[PDB]
């Protein structure tokens, strides 16, 4: 299924994911696509900061949901 | 309007805090600080976040703790000065648990508050913000404040005041944010700056059921005009210090996985709102992060709201 | 006589001064209007930093001159 990941300034990507995928795996997908280290990725959904060991389905993340990514400095 | 100015004695304390704490690497980091809720007592960590955003690199130099560094800390002082003015204009300011309001504070109290605010996140040893880490880090900052106060600030603070401001920094589980106006204004200032690292949910809708957003909170306290002006002023400080400035787009609020009742409430308070974002800037990030000179030069460059005044 | 000062926020203000005023007196008048302590002030005219115990007349600062206020640095 596809989800959206948007930075706080509104730069958007999609990812191809499954409900059981861990947050750690989502961050590795972001690193693959955009080159951002997982340790620079603070991800937020429905007001909650996401924990590596939990799954998309643990947060009720579904098809065409939007996650926010708090990136401090591209290339930093 | 008049400019927002920090006292020169305050700027001396900011230099000490920067040199001894805010410039320093986080220490509760590495393989021993990783976390998995499935195997929770596996490492020293008791929750997630210890390895998040530890530093960023600008022209080959590391800027440690960029989410809780000098620029964050100094922006909070500007906000308390601004809210002091707004509270004194309010027909009916907020009455804290001690019966006192922000409008009952003197200019000397604001100086004291400003000093305490410099230490509010100084005790952090990572970006971890789960309860145990959060509370330990606020305890550490409180003790760093008390040590420095006794060494250099006993002409300003009595021992009773040192313990009162230390308890504000500690932000104990059992204490309310609005126990006193000194503590309330410290929490409100921190609250405003969260716009740098929170999604639209926390900012406008409230992070959970029964919690007001950041911006609704300012509108309830200061009225819609002044609350929105405070928000825009913070944004201005963000741009001056090279933060990523978030976009605002109320048409997106219903699509972020939150209940429709929280979205209706935010629209009835805030109104429809749309404001462009702005990308972070490495040179300004460095200027504001690496020295009090740099940081205060940026902050004092930003125009203040039209209604800002101070008695001289 | 009237001179102008560009403040830290970029706003223009007016001061009433005499040629015989010291740079220290000038910074006091800026404090009285804007609340900026003299310590934090560095004043620039025609690209030169102005020194506390000189006078406006010493710098040939005449009516309707504009001074630039910048932050006096502490080295930290």
Phi, psi of A65, deg, nearest 5: -60, 155
The C-alpha of B25 sits at a distance from chain C's nearest C-alpha, in angstroms, of 18
Q: Which of C7, C9, C69 to mutate to test the interface with B (most CBs of B within 10 A)?
A: C9
Helices B107-118 and B159-170 pack at an angle, to 10 degrees, of 50
CB B106 within 8 A of CB B181: no
Closest CA to B189 of B234, B135, B125, B143: B234
Question: CA nearest B234: which of B191, B184, B267, B199?
Answer: B191
Please report which helix (H) or strand (E) contains residue C49, including its range: strand C48-49
**What tokens appear for C22 in the block?**
């010291």
CB of B83 within 8 A of CB of B185?
A: yes
- Nearest to residue A5, comparing CAs of A39, A29, A37? A29
Closest Cβ–Cβ partner in B49, B277, B285 for A10: B277
| Gyration radius of chain C over CA positions | 11
Whether there are 3 or more C-beta pairs closer than 8 Å between C and A is no
Do residue B277 and residue A9 have CB atoms under 8 angstroms apart? yes
Rounded Cα gap, residues C21 and C16, in angstroms: 10
Distance, in angstroms, between B160 CA and closest chain A CA? 38
Q: Is B247 exposed, middle or buried (0-12, 13-18, 19+ CB in 10 A)?
A: middle
Instruction: For residue B280, give both structure tokens.
Output: 């972070």
Collect all residues from C whose CB is shorter than 8 A from any CB in B: 7-11, 32, 34-37, 39-40, 71, 73-76
Strands A2-7 and A66-70, how do they pair?
Answer: parallel
Of A42, A68, A74, the CB nearest to B280: A74
CA distance B17 to chain C (A): 11
Query: For B258-305, what is the HEC assignment?
Result: CCHHHHHHHHHHHCCCEECCECCCHHHHHHHHHCHHHHHHHHCCCCCC
User: Per CB distance under 8 Å, which residues of A are interface residues toward B?
Assistant: 7-10, 39-42, 44-49, 51-54, 60-61, 65-66, 68, 70-76
Q: Are B51 and A39 a contacting pair at CB < 8 A? A: yes
Read off the tokens for A71: 């990136």
Distance CA B202, CA B214 (A): 7
| Helices and strands in chain C, H and E counts | 1, 5
Q: Are B289 and B67 in contact (CB under 8 A)?
A: no
B135 phi/psi in degrees, rounded to 5: -75, -40
Are B282 and A73 in contact (CB < 8 Å)?
Answer: yes
Which residue do the tokens 């308070």 mark? B269
Q: What is the largest CA-CA distance in chain A?
A: 32
Give start and end residues of each alpha helix (H) in B97-211.
107-118, 131-152, 159-170, 181-193, 200
Which of A76, A21, A35 is closest to A67 using CA atoms?
A21
Q: Do chains B and C touch (3 or more CB pairs under 8 A)?
A: yes
Tell me if there are at least 3 CB pairs under 8 Å linking chains A and B.
Answer: yes
CA atoms within 13 A on the CB side of B25: 10
Q: Is B14 on the interface with C (CB under 8 A)?
A: no
Resolution of the determined structure in angstroms stands at: 1.7
A-chain residues near B207 (CB < 8 A): 47-48
Q: Does B53 touch chain A (CB under 8 A)?
A: yes
| Inter-residue contact A8 to A70 (CB < 8 Å) | yes
Q: Where are the domains of chain A?
A: 1-76
Considering only CB atoms, which chain C residues are within 8 Å of B291?
A: 76
Work out how many CB contacts closer than 8 A connect B with C: 46
Measured between beta carbons, the chain B residues lying within 8 angstroms of A24 are: none
Tokens at B68, concatenated: 């809780």
Reading the block at residue B287, the tokens are 């200027």
Chain-centroid distance of CA B220 in Å reads 19
């Amino acid at each position: 299924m596809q989800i959206f990941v948007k930075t706080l300034t509104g730069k958007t990507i999609t990812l191809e994911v499954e409900p059981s995928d861990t947050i750690e795996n989502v961050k590795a997908k972001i690193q693959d696509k955009e080159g951002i280290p997982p340790d620079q990725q603070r991800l937020i959904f429905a007001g909650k900061q996401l924990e590596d060991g939990r799954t998309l389905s643990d947060y009720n993340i579904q098809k065409e949901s939007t996650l926010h990514l708090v990136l401090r400095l591209r290339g930093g | 309007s008049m400019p927002i100015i920090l006292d020169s004695d305050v700027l001396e304390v900011a230099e000490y805090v920067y040199k001894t704490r805010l410039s320093q690497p986080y220490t509760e980091v590495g393989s021993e600080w990783e976390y998995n809720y499935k195997n929770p007592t596996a490492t020293f960590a008791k929750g997630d976040g210890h390895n998040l955003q530890r530093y960023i690199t600008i022209d080959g130099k590391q800027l440690h703790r960029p989410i809780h560094g000098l620029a964050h800390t100094m922006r909070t002082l500007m906000y308390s000065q601004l809210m002091y003015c707004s509270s004194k204009k309010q027909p009916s300011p907020h009455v804290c648990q001690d019966g006192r309001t922000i409008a009952d504070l003197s200019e000397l109290d604001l100086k004291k508050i400003n000093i305490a605010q410099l230490f509010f996140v100084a005790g952090r040893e990572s970006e971890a913000s789960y309860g145990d880490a959060y509370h330990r880090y606020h305890l550490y900052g409180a003790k760093q404040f008390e040590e420095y106060a006794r060494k250099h600030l006993t002409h300003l603070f009595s021992e009773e005041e040192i313990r009162l401001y230390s308890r504000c920094i500690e932000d104990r589980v059992g204490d309310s944010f609005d126990g006193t106006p000194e503590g309330y204004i410290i929490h409100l200032s921190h609250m405003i700056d969260l716009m740098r690292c929170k999604s639209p949910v926390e900012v406008f809708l409230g992070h959970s059921k029964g919690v007001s957003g950041i911006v609704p909170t300012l509108i309830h306290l200061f009225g819609k005009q002044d609350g929105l002006d405070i928000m825009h002023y913070a944004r201005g400080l963000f741009a001056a210090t090279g933060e990523a400035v978030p976009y605002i787009d109320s048409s997106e609020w219903p699509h972020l996985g939150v209940d429709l009742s929280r979205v209706q409430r935010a629209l009835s308070i805030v109104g429809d709102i749309n404001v462009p974002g702005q990308e972070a800037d490495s040179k300004k990030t460095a200027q504001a992060g690496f020295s009090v000179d740099g940081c205060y030069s940026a902050l004092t460059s930003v125009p203040t709201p039209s209604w800002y005044e101070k008695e001289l």
